[PDB]
Write a protein that binds this ligand. Structure first.
Ligand SMILES: Nc1nc2c(ncn2[C@@H]2O[C@H](COP(=O)(O)OP(=O)(O)O)[C@@H](O)[C@H]2O)c(=O)[nH]1
Ligand SMILES: Nc1nc2c(ncn2[C@@H]2O[C@H](COP(=O)(O)OP(=O)(O)O)[C@@H](O)[C@H]2O)c(=O)[nH]1
Lengths: 234, 233
């Protein structure tokens, strides 16, 4: 039989992939420079699609109660296409959300909480924006106090060798730096060179967290859309 | 005859000397720590007045601002004085000699800021970009030019009268810390950021102020007179 996972695997490369991630934070603490760095190409609601090969369809919906509305509009178009006489169906259900928190804050701000309370029923990855601004000791205090406030209020993406993947689940929320310019890519200060893909900055754990977990497809599919389905169909 | 300048130089140290500075920006992009770095001591409207020696003692008052409430307070000081100046006996005047407005490195000049500065600048404004280590040097100057072009588009900032090099570097982009590593500065694992090095532009601002506490007269003649010429009418 063992040739049948093969069949699935051979099927997927032939066919696939698709994905749609959503970017909220605050204009501007490095969101469009970082989402560009993520995938090694460059690019009120505005949406942008583009393909990568190595085959991946990305719809990076950058958000430039209106957003509770769009992502939930998409639960509604898919409940529509399912039901549903002739089915082919293109799901632009947002697989993941990337909430950028700014490094100036003892803090996680009230807006950030207010928002995540509203949008935590899609998968949220909290990401600390522009971490070149943070000292190591400073980075640590911020990371812990964010996580602390999260259990104090907020469903988040509960994230599914061992020593290595423990470290990944630990360092969340990832602090990161983005840039298209390179000198090694590239933040040039007359005292030092900020170097993405090191930790230095948390860019590799996030980028690799995103790639290994594109079973966010399922989390979003089963947990969050069904609940809109159970909900409006009542 | 020209000890007479020495007669004035002596009287001034023996009395000297006292100043008040006002802080507005945005909690928190480094305003409370920078100002500590600047005088070398750690410290709705709130004021902290502390006394510093160096033979001259400076009576430094520091009125930090947290968030129409602000112009009210800066102006009350004008009316406290107009009452007091015009009173029968003679006054301890807390007019705001000068304000540092703190602009954030997270802008390609924000609209709260232009709107705020518009209303107020009849108080001397020092525009200072906060936490300057955030900006790479090309972003540092590119941002400086956008503000500097945006500032004139509307805004009276405080006009600064080898004073040659300071004129260009304003608005200042400062980097404040009260930790200390291998001389004040910050510890990143790729490099080390020095307070006071230009590199930082904290030094240019530091001396901009000590060298100019003729901000004292600017307030007294131009800003207060007009409150007075105005409120009298
Ligand atoms: N040091 C540092 N500088 C950054 C970082 N991200 C962006 N910058 C710089 O500041 C700008 C950030 O703007 P942008 O990428 O448009 O962020 P956005 O407004 O959220 O889309 C960039 O053009 C860079 O010049 C970062 O992570 N670290
Ligand atoms: N990158 C950078 N970070 C700073 C600088 N100065 C302070 N910080 C950090 O930001 C915090 C500033 O605190 P504070 O000065 O009280 O901010 P504020 O009072 O809200 O304006 C400190 O805890 C430092 O960790 C700076 O010059 N550059």
């Amino acid at each position: 039989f063992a040739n049948l996972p093969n069949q699935v695997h051979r099927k997927s490369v032939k066919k696939g992939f698709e994905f749609t991630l959503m970017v909220v934070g605050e204009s501007g603490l490095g969101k469009s420079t970082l989402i560009n760095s993520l995938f090694l190409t460059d690019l009120t609601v505005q949406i942008e699609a583009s393909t990568v090969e190595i085959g991946v369809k990305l719809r990076l919906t950058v958000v430039d109660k209106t957003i509770i509305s769009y992502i939930d509009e998409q639960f509604e178009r898919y409940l529509h296409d399912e039901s549903g006489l002739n089915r082919r169906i293109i799901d632009n259900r947002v697989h993941c959300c990337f909430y950028f928190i700014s490094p100036f804050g003892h803090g996680l701000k009230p807006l950030d909480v207010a928002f995540m309370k509203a949008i935590h029923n899609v998968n949220i990855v909290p990401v600390i924006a522009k971490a070149d601004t943070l000292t190591l000791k400073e980075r640590e205090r911020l990371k812990k106090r964010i996580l602390d406030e999260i259990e104090e209020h907020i469903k988040i993406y509960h994230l599914p060798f061992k020593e290595q993947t423990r470290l990944l689940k630990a360092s969340i929320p990832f602090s990161v730096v983005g840039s298209n310019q390179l000198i090694v890519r590239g933040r040039l200060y007359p005292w030092g060179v900020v170097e993405v893909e090191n930790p230095h900055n948390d860019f590799l754990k996030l980028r690799t967290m995103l790639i290994t977990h594109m079973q966010d497809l399922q989390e979003v599919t089963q947990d969050l859309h069904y609940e809109n389905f159970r909900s409006e169909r009542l």
